[PDB]
From Swiss-Prot:
Active site per the UniProt annotation: 112, 273, 287
Location(s) in or outside the cell: Host endoplasmic reticulum membrane
Organism: Severe acute respiratory syndrome coronavirus 2
Part of the whole protein covered: 1564 to 1877 of 4405
Name of the protein in its database record: Papain-like protease nsp3
Function: Responsible for the cleavages located at the N-terminus of the replicase polyprotein. Participates together with nsp4 in the assembly of virally-induced cytoplasmic double-membrane vesicles necessary for viral replication. Antagonizes innate immune induction of type I interferon by blocking the phosphorylation, dimerization and subsequent nuclear translocation of host IRF3. Also prevents host NF-kappa-B signaling. In addition, PL-PRO possesses a deubiquitinating/deISGylating activity and processes both 'Lys-48'- and 'Lys-63'-linked polyubiquitin chains from cellular substrates.
Organism taxonomic ancestry: Viruses, Riboviria, Orthornavirae, Pisuviricota, Pisoniviricetes
Domain Peptidase C16 residue range list: 72-315
Catalytic activity: Thiol-dependent hydrolysis of ester, thioester, amide, peptide and isopeptide bonds formed by the C-terminal Gly of ubiquitin (a 76-residue protein attached to proteins as an intracellular targeting signal)
Domain Ubiquitin-like: 3-58
């Protein structure tokens, strides 16, 4: 005939908390659809006295929740919260040790790519546009990176345990970063075809694929031209607080004081292991929870990050 109730809050953003009177004879699922209590799926659980006043995540299935989700995450996909909460149930059980002053991740579920990306973000000037990434990145820097890692996986449409790529991950994250004032001018000189200047803005201005060396990029890299000859491409001008230089993994020497940090990738095309190298008073190799130092480093490098502000060529 009737039922005892308690009050809970529902949310999509953990900023707007919506009061609900819940029926203790029904599951959360029967009342809200998919329901989460800090990452755990409580869809098939009934309300208990200890739930009173707690905050539960639900999917944005009305105009109020869609707008709160859009404003906080910058996403229009209602399955986003599903992917976030699913990932969060795993990432909350990972460990985030401080290693050489940075939040790292102890190895689990092929998360070596996320560890190296997390370590990279803490050493380059990058501000996120979605309030969700601002809030979770701040917590990650203080050593609580579970929410941040879960958000990265949701934004990249990757599940816990999927193999990942640092370059691919940084590329998705950069789309959600404020890079509008980033600018790159390239010149391409071909003996036959002549000169062509190109101006790039945003992500295209901070990422390059084909050489690991910022110095080589400034001096000139050879690339095929449509005449069938090789042309030379060189960086004329750079306005950005960092650049990311990427290439297929190859044996490469990293020299102390000449870069910020780098990603090493050992193994093969379809599986392998990432490590992070950082240039401090010496070269530190961070491998999840593990730390080794050396004055020199040679290894298979895929990505090198360099600090920048303003560069103009003298060529
Ligand atoms: C009582 O039954 C409901 C069901 C759902 C639902 O979204 N179901 C649903 C299942 C699987 C999936 S899923 O498999 O696609 N996946 C996406 C992420 C997590 C699960 C998505 C949605 C939602 C409601 C609420 C609708 C709004 N009012 C105000 C409150 C009730 C009631
Ligand atoms: C609480 O204040 C509101 C916020 C938004 C919103 O969509 N905000 C919002 C921000 C950034 C972004 S964004 O960063 O993802 N980006 C994508 C395209 C343009 C901006 C998207 C959405 C919408 C409303 C409603 C007020 C009354 N209703 C009937 C109409 C809308 C209220
Ligand atoms: C182990 O040997 C590797 C070789 C390559 C390669 O050349 N990939 C590759 C991608 C796009 C492009 S491209 O689309 O950007 N474009 C540029 C020139 C040709 C196509 C070019 C090359 C890539 C990998 C990665 C495989 C797994 N990830 C996690 C890390 C390393 C490993
Ligand atoms: Cl930020
Ligand atoms: Cl640097
Ligand atoms: Na940073
Ligand atoms: Zn040419």
């Amino acid at each position: 005939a009737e039922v005892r109730t308690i009050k809970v809050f529902t949310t999509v953003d953990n900023i707007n908390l919506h009061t609900q009177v819940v029926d203790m004879s029904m599951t959360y699922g029967q009342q809200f659809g998919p329901t989460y209590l800090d990452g755990a799926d409580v869809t098939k659980i009934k309300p208990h006295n200890s739930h009173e006043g707690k905050t539960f995540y639900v999917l944005p299935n009305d105009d109020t929740l869609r707008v709160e989700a859009f404003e906080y995450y910058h996403t229009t996909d209602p399955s986003f919260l599903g992917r976030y909460m699913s990932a969060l149930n795993h990432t909350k059980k990972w460990k985030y040790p401080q290693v050489n002053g940075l939040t790292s991740i102890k190895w689990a579920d092929n998360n070596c790519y996320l560890a190296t990306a997390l370590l990279t973000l803490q050493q380059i000037e990058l501000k996120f546009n979605p309030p969700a990434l601002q809030d979770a990145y701040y917590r990650a820097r203080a050593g609580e990176a579970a929410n941040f890692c879960a958000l990265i996986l949701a934004y990249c449409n990757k599940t816990v345990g999927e193999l990942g790529d640092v370059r691919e991950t940084m590329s998705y994250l950069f789309q959600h970063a404020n890079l509008d004032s980033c600018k790159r001018v390239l010149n391409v000189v071909c003996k036959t075809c002549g000169q062509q200047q190109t101006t790039l803005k945003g992500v295209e201005a901070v990422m390059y694929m084909g050489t690991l060396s910022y110095e080589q990029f400034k001096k000139g890299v050879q690339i095929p031209c449509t005449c069938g000859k090789q042309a030379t491409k060189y960086l004329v001008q750079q306005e950005s607080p960092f650049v990311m230089m990427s290439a297929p993994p190859a044996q490469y020497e990293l020299k102390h004081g000449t870069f910020t940090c780098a990603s090493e990738y050992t193994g093969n095309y379809q599986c392998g292991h990432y490590k992070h190298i950082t240039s401090k008073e010496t070269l530190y190799c961070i491998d999840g929870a593990l730390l080794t130092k050396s004055s020199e480093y040679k290894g298979p490098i895929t990505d090198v990050f360099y600090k920048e502000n303003s560069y103009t060529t003298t060529i």
